[PDB]
Amino acid sequence: TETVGKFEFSRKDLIGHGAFAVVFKGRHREKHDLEVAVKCINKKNLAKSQTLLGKEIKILKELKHENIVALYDFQEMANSVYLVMEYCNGGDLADYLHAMRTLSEDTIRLFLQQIAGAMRLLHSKGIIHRDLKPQNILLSNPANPNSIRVKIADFGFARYLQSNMMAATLCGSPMYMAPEVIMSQHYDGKADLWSIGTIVYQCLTGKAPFQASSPQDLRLFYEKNKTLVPTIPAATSAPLRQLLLALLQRNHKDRMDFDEFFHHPFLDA
Ligand SMILES: COc1cc2nc(-c3cc(F)ccc3O)nc(N[C@@H]3CNC[C@H]3C(C)(C)O)c2cc1OC
Ligand SMILES: [Mg+2]
Numbered sequence: 001t002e003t004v005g006k007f008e009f010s011r012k013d014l015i016g017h018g019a020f021a022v023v024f025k026g027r028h029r030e031k032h033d034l035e036v037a038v039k040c041i042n043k044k045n046l047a048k049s050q051t052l053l054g055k056e057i058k059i060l061k062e063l064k065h066e067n068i069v070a071l072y073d074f075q076e077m078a079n080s081v082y083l084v085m086e087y088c089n090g091g092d093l094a095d096y097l098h099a100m101r102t103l104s105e106d107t108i109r110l111f112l113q114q115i116a117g118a119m120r121l122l123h124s125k126g127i128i129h130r131d132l133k134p135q136n137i138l139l140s141n142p143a144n145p146n147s148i149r150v151k152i153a154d155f156g157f158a159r160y161l162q163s164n165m166m167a168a169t170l171c172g173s174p175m176y177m178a179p180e181v182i183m184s185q186h187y188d189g190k191a192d193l194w195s196i197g198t199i200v201y202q203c204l205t206g207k208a209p210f211q212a213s214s215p216q217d218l219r220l221f222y223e224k225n226k227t228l229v230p231t232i233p234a235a236t237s238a239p240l241r242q243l244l245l246a247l248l249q250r251n252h253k254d255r256m257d258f259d260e261f262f263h264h265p266f267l268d269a
């Protein structure tokens with residue numbers, strides 16, 4: 001049993017591990033029924049893991065929203081970092097997708113309304129996430145209609161971007177990266193909108209809108225194709241088709257902006 005502030009966990013109770021983090025289930029030390037996830041350094045990638053967990057603290061401690069994973073506490077030291085977060089008992093969207101194969105438009109709508117809500121807060125705070133993908137979207141069953149909650153997680157790559165500035169760090173997951181990102185160009189908040197478009201397309205069809213055999217091939221594809229048009233099934237509703245075409249614009253100046261996304265007809269009741 002290890003303690004972190006008012007919280008504890010055992011390393012027997014593994015939730016999962018990736019290259020840059022290990023997560024365990026724990027609990028509050030007084031209120032044993034308050035469950036938490038405790039994210040810890042992955043010592044196989046020590047320096048990068050430590051950096052990303054520190055960055056995640058700096059961002060998440062400023063965000064309180066039902067659709068963003070809550071940071072209850074954290075502990076940063078010279079050689080260790082812990083985040084104590086709300087436990088998301090539903091697992092991630094990637095695993096849900098693996099079982100469902102595809103989602104109904106009504107489900108896509110429910111999830112995307114919640115994602116949009118989170119993105120409204122990020123945008124108002126001047127934060128870009130930079131690693132939106134199904135593996136970083138968690139599900140939580142907290143009474144009320146459609147109570148399942150989506151939560152954006154894994155803010156290790158996130159940054160503040162001043163509204164008259166552009167980012168240039170190459171980070172993210174190639175399959176979900178906007179063309180401008182993977183082509184090593186300057187980018188802004190609309191790169192995340194491409195990632196979202198990609199997620200929605202994947203929920204709808206079970207596939208990526210532009211498949212390649214590698215990151216290098218995908219880059220070359222974007223470089224050579226000045227116009228990108230994803231294949232949308234004929235059965236797709238008109239509002240969802242329009243949303244996807246507007247999110248999955250190659251050129252960020254032609255891509256849908258935040259205000260249009262937040263008020264898109266697809267997202268209406
Ligand atoms: C109930 O089942 C699960 C709960 C999970 N909760 C969190 C989780 C992560 C947080 F950062 C905070 C709260 C949480 O609950 N994270 C999981 N997996 C993470 C997220 N997707 C990839 C994977 C990893 C470790 C590579 O990042 C869970 C996987 C689960 O099942 C496989
Ligand atoms: Mg991130």
Ligand SMILES: [Mg+2]
Nearest residue numbers: 187188191252
């Ligand atoms: Mg951009």
Ligand code: NA
Nearest residue numbers: 062063125126
């Ligand atoms: Na802030």
